[PDB]
Amino acid sequence: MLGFLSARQTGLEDPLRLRRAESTRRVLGLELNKDRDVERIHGGGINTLDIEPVEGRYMLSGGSDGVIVLYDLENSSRQSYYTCKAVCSIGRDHPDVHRYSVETVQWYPHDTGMFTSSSFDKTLKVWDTNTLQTADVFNFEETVYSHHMSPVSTKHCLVAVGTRGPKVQLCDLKSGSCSHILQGHRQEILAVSWSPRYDYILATASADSRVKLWDVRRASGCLITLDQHNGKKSQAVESANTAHNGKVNGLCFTSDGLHLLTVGTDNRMRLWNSSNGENTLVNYGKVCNNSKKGLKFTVSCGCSSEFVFVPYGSTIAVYTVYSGEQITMLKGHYKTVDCCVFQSNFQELYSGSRDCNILAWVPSL
């Protein structure tokens, strides 16, 4: 590493080299945090986490008990040991608390003054973070499994919602229009994710073992349907062209948005060319998941090699996205891990699981 510092000082290597190499080294040295703790307030398992995209300071967490906790991740104390204190809380005494489990919570991109939370109580609530009051509510005829706002859209502000209905809802936060729907799936839509690269590209994964990419501006259904075999087993499109041999319960675009990682209940993760949905045949081995709802997993950013952190039983499996090589198992949870969210500023990880714990993984040394 002194070689890295010397090369940076002497201009031999771009500082990009040291930055991404050290980010990768930090991610590889991920371990149970020696001096850090997260305050425990959820009475039930944490189903979702979200660190705000700008300044990466505050973290939302939705629990199976319906409460939403807002934590400050910064060590505002002077000690090396600190607990991520809870700033705010939609608790059981809040007038607008979710009646059932909160399954997805997401900070509004471009601004930390608002966030959103969808629950199995058939509601997508939009909260003002300052007053901590519901600015809006969208009701659905069937329970919400996931939702996502575009991390890129300066123009549109649509929330793509996947419920147990076979339709992907698009709720306009600009003047409230939840009527827009996308047809083409056949069972519950367990995951939805906007492309970080393209403004109007949305990937939706449903229990019909299919993943569809939509240009929501378009009037002609999905753009691409992901196919495991790319055409080896080709059939007229009524039941073929499946992404997995089970329910596809998780989506994640890579950092650049040029590839898509789909995890399904066939104990398989697959990497897809996001421009034509071709399977890249990256192996990843066996990725154990049996979740009946959406599975939240994230990818690394700002590193020499991209990593993907997938909940794997009661562990976090870290894989290399483009080679599939298994990095490691982060092993500190006592029950199945529901979500993991990656802090890209310091290569940190926060994992929420059914054991009512949010565990922080920090690079060692």
Binding site: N33, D37, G332, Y334, D355, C356
Partner: protein
């Protein structure tokens, strides 16, 4: 020097005694203090015993584990490395993996491991936050009655 250690551990555990016979336990203490890899060899012996199907044998193995825990620090790091499996094998938390017979020895194992875990939370909890996680998980998620 592994033969005598496997032996001594075997007579300690297979005997099924209510209480640890003192002088051979002292021999175990000395010869476990001798080397660190051989202390961890004793740890593997304990782990292999703890999976085996008899409540008295699991009780003997757990009491040896408690002796080394209160007596050794690298043992504390090594056991907190897999405290999850340690709790699965001691407390019988998972319904799919309950404790073998007899019922009396299993009950004594439950009481002894609850109280030992209480003592470990009081004495080494701050140095091992994973022990704190395990204690908290037992006290709320599994609702283990520590007052029993």
């Amino acid at each position: 020097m592994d033969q005598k250690l496997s032996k001594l551990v075997e007579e300690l555990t297979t005997s099924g005694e209510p209480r640890l016979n003192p002088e051979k336990m002292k021999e175990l203490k000395k010869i476990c203090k001798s080397s660190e890899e051989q202390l961890s060899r004793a740890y593997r012996l304990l782990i292999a015993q703890l999976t085996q199907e008899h409540a008295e044998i699991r009780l003997s193995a757990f009491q040896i584990v408690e002796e080394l825990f209160v007596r050794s620090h690298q043992f504390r790091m090594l056991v907190v490395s897999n405290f999850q499996e340690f709790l699965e094998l001691t407390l019988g938390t998972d319904p799919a993996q309950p404790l073998p017979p007899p019922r009396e020895a299993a009950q004594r194992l439950r009481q002894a491991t609850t109280r030992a875990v209480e003592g470990w939370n009081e004495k080494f909890g701050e140095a091992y936050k994973k022990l704190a996680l395990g204690y908290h998980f037992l006290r709320h998620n599994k609702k283990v009655d520590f007052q029993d």
